[PDB]
Structures are given as structure tokens and as C-alpha cells.
Design an enzyme around this catalytic site. Structure first.
Site, PDB file in Angstrom:
ATOM      1  N   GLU A 226      42.786  -3.637  -8.096  1.00  0.00           N
ATOM      2  CA  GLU A 226      41.973  -4.816  -8.323  1.00  0.00           C
ATOM      3  C   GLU A 226      42.240  -5.821  -7.185  1.00  0.00           C
ATOM      4  OE1 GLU A 226      40.980  -5.609 -12.465  1.00  0.00           O
ATOM      5  OE2 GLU A 226      39.310  -5.665 -11.056  1.00  0.00           O
TER       6      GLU A 226
ATOM      7  N   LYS B 284      41.249  -9.838  -6.072  1.00  0.00           N
ATOM      8  CA  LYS B 284      40.698 -11.108  -6.543  1.00  0.00           C
ATOM      9  C   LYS B 284      40.746 -12.138  -5.416  1.00  0.00           C
ATOM     10  CE  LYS B 284      40.506  -9.769 -10.900  1.00  0.00           C
ATOM     11  NZ  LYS B 284      39.292  -9.792 -11.745  1.00  0.00           N
TER      12      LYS B 284
ATOM     13  N   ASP C  85      37.665  -3.749 -10.299  1.00  0.00           N
ATOM     14  CA  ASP C  85      36.821  -3.633  -9.112  1.00  0.00           C
ATOM     15  C   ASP C  85      37.304  -2.562  -8.132  1.00  0.00           C
ATOM     16  OD1 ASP C  85      39.026  -5.201  -8.356  1.00  0.00           O
ATOM     17  OD2 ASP C  85      37.883  -6.213  -6.787  1.00  0.00           O
TER      18      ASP C  85
END
EC number: 3.1.21.4
Lengths: 261, 261
Positions: free
Chosen positions: B95, B97, B75
Site C-alpha cells: 500500500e 499513501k 492499492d
DNA sequence: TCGCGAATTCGCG
DNA sequence: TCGCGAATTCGCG
């Protein structure tokens, strides 16, 4: 069929043993084959144990632990053997995962989707969690030259050949295994560096690029590629084979016990 | 605050940039610092690209591909730099999360559980999927001596200090970070071999045990340990730092371009 | 169209 | 009790 292996294998099939029970069967078979050695089955490993193994590699490793009693619990457990030094060495870690209910939904003529008008369910990604325990065991076994981690895949998300499923009303649904709609096998290939699936990769490979000569820890990834359920007898053979390979790599540290008897 | 870094950082904070936009900001900052070098941002990498990088390491690696157009999409994307050979080298993969809604549920006085009588939700394990992309990038970067993979954690499942949340009715809920009820940090520590969290681990460490001298690829794992949201400015600094470190490791292959200008 | 990703609730012992 | 695990539906572009 290899002597006692054939026998134990029929027993596993006769009881459709779960992967964890198959591991216990492998332990018993190993003890039978090698009466001079000592084997054991464990269903879990504490994160403190992993950290300690990591520290032996390098003092800066294995320094974190947020939940003191944290651990990992491979659904297939762990099988170990005692070496000539009295230390327990891992010979097998097994795990079985499932994903993809399409074959069951079709057989039941049950449409799916937010509109309940789909034959197939676009496959999810939960299977990606499998990489965590593979990483944990690789770390635990960083000093070892073998990595007997075996993962068994089952479900409509792990196809390796096209199959056909017939609905109750007779309509036949054809599934293409190479379809990204359902196939999530590529979500696991990083675990064995793209080496062949359905193979015993227990013996660590070493490679280089700049006078590096680095060690790879490749999980053995098996799938029932036709969407059917796994046959416990074949899981047993796969697992016994992996474990046997572990003993081979560990041979130099088992000699003394095979002698004195 | 380090010159232009301070400026870009304020811009990121002013726009509460998402991790992916922060990566684009890092690319721009790098181009500013090193006008002679060429940088680029990519939001994805095809599995064929990974396989090709793996094959260069050893012909038996990267041989599997079930879904031809399979890929990974961190992402935060990927930032790369062109070396003196014309090859693109990864300087950063980011990334972010999330997991754990307790702090929000408490603030809202919303009880949870199958009986709706719990203050806290026993934390799940989806965060384990993070290990897959870390493994994919490690494989893609197997020939590299750096691994600029940064993971940003946010939520009630990644606490590193005890915090207190007050309900609407005034009742205060105290959370102990070392509680396995919610803490899932130990589910990520395998990714950096237990090395320190919230640290730049971009430079690969080498270790041994039997004249092995193996290479470790440790992800840099950061968490907003107080349950608050991440400050884009600090994410930017972390990411720029990691990227700078990548360039340092890649220095020998960037000399020619820094010269000719 | 296809294919990657979000991250959740609660079973279990 | 606490702490690991199951693996799912469907958003998104």
C-alpha cells in the site's frame, strides 16, 4: 435501573450528555459503587506514555517518536482505577463517531451529488480512522487481559435495519441497510474480529492454530442502527457495564484495597 | 543488483511503476527465482474470504457481514503462493499513501490557510485510515507466523529529516521534521508497535507478560523522509525482500513442491 | 448498478 | 504556539 445506575442514567438522559461527559458520569458512579477504590478521568494519553507501556512488554517495542509531544485524544476520554500496586489501570476508553447525512438531507428535501439530483450520498470512508486509536489503546494495554474500548456509531452510514424517510413534498425514500451505497459497518468489523456488534467484548479471548495461544483485543462496537441519535442513558449503561467488566478482570489486583478500609 | 533483482529493478525504475505494478513485478521475479512454485497477484479480497479465514481460527470470529459483497482493495494488491496443500498463502500486501502538499505549495509560492497567508498547511489525519486494511490483513493472516504488509509513505507530512524549499521569489522555507505542524508519522507507529520504521518486520514476534506468549503482527512502514517521490526500484527491492521473507516463514509448507520437479 | 478509496481544509483549545 | 480531530464529496471501474 440497577439501583444507583438507574438514577445516574436518568441524569445522563436529562442532560443529553456527550460521550465524554458520560465517561465522567461513569467515573462518579464507579466511585459511588466502590468507595474504597480510586478512579480518575483523563481526556488524553501522550505517545510517550504508550511507548513506555510497550517497552515494558519488550525492549524493542515503542522505540519511535517523531513529534515529542504527540498524543491521542479519544473524544470519550479514558477512565482508570488505581491498583494495589499504585499503578493506574484502564477500565474504559470511549469514542463516538458520526457519518452519513442522508436522513437529514431527505427530511429537508435536499438533493445531492455533483448534479444535485441524488436522494442519497455515496458514503465516504473517514470512519476508517477509528482503527488508529483502537490500535493505540490495544498497544497501551498489551499487558492487560481486558480491552474496554467502546465505539459508538451514529448516522445513515451505520444502519442495521431498513428505515423510511419522508421528504417535505411527501415523497418517501426507502433505505436498505444491507446496501453498500451507504453501509460502512464492514469498515469497522476488523476491530472486533467479526465478533458480535452491540456487545461487551471487554474480556480478551485467546485462540490458537499452532500451539500459539494468542490474545485478541476486540473493541466493543455499538451502533444506533435505525439512524436515530444515541440515547445518553443507554450509552451510560453500556459504558458502566464495560467498566464493571474491567474491574472484574482486574480483581486480583484490587483485593487489598477493597479489604483495608 | 542481486542478479535478476538488479535487472527487474532497473525495469521498475525505467517505467516509474506504481506500487500495484511493482507488486506484479515482484510476482514475476518470484516465479523466475522459484520456477517450481506457483504465484499469483490479486487486487482485492472479499470480506467473505476474511470471515472464512477468521472462522477457521475460532467459530465465534468472522460472524458479521452487513454488505454481502463488501471487500478491501490495497492499492498495491496482494501476492500469494500455493503451498504443498494446494492452499494460497499471502507473501505480500503493499500500500502507498500520500499526504502533505507543502513542498509543492512552497515551490509554487502559493500561500495557504483561510486567509491565504500561511507558508504551511496544518497537516490532516486521513492517513489514519491506513490502520483499517492493516487490521483486515492481520485478521486474514491470523493463522500465519509472518505478516508481509508494507506501507509506503510520501509527502510533506512524513518527514524524517529537516529540508529546505525555495519559493519563486527566492524566499527559503525551512521545515523541521520533528514539528507536529506537519509530521503525522506518529499516527502510523501503532501499526508496528513502535518497532523501527523503514525495516522488514515480516517475521512475527511473540512476547509475554503473564505466561501469555502472544503474537504481534507488525506492518513494515517505509517513508521517503526527504519529501521526495518514491523510487520504484527501491520499492521493488523492499517488496521483493518482504516477499522472500514470507517464503522463508512458509518454507515447511513449500518443501514438497521444491522437490518434485 | 455498487462499493472502495483519495486525502483534504480548517475547527479547536 | 502546536498538534489531534471532524468526516466530507465525489473519482473510479
Amino acid at each position: 435501573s440497577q439501583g444507583v445506575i438507574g438514577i445516574f442514567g436518568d441524569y445522563a438522559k436529562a442532560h443529553d450528555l456527550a460521550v465524554g461527559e458520560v465517561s465522567k458520569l461513569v467515573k462518579k458512579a464507579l466511585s459511588n459503587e466502590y468507595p474504597q477504590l480510586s478512579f480518575r478521568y483523563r481526556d488524553s494519553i501522550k505517545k510517550t506514555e504508550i511507548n513506555e507501556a510497550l517497552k515494558k512488554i519488550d525492549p524493542d517495542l515503542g522505540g519511535t517518536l517523531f513529534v515529542s509531544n504527540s498524543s491521542i485524544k479519544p473524544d470519550g476520554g479514558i477512565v482508570e482505577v488505581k491498583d494495589d500496586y499504585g499503578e493506574w489501570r484502564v477500565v474504559l476508553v470511549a469514542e463516538a463517531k458520526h457519518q452519513g447525512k442522508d436522513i437529514i438531507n431527505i427530511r429537508n428535501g435536499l438533493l445531492v451529488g455533483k448534479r444535485g439530483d441524488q436522494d442519497l450520498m455515496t458514503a465516504g470512508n473517514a470512519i476508517e480512522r477509528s482503527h488508529k486509536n483502537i490500535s493505540e489503546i490495544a498497544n497501551f494495554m498489551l499487558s492487560e487481559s481486558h480491552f474496554p474500548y467502546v465505539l459508538f456509531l451514529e448516522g445513515s452510514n451505520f444502519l442495521t435495519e431498513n428505515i423510511s424517510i419522508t421528504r417535505p413534498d411527501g415523497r418517501v425514500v426507502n433505505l436498505e441497510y444491507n446496501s453498500g451505497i451507504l453501509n460502512r459497518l464492514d469498515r469497522l468489523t476488523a476491530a472486533n474480529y467479526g465478533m458480535p456488534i452491540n456487545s461487551n467484548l471487554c474480556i480478551n479471548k485467546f485462540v490458537n492454530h499452532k500451539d500459539k495461544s494468542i490474545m485478541l483485543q476486540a473493541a466493543s462496537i455499538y451502533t444506533q442502527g435505525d439512524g436515530r441519535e444515541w440515547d445518553s442513558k443507554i450509552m451510560f449503561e453500556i459504558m458502566f457495564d464495560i467498566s464493571t467488566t474491567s474491574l472484574r478482570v482486574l480483581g486480583r489486583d484490587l483485593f487489598e484495597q477493597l479489604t483495608s478500609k
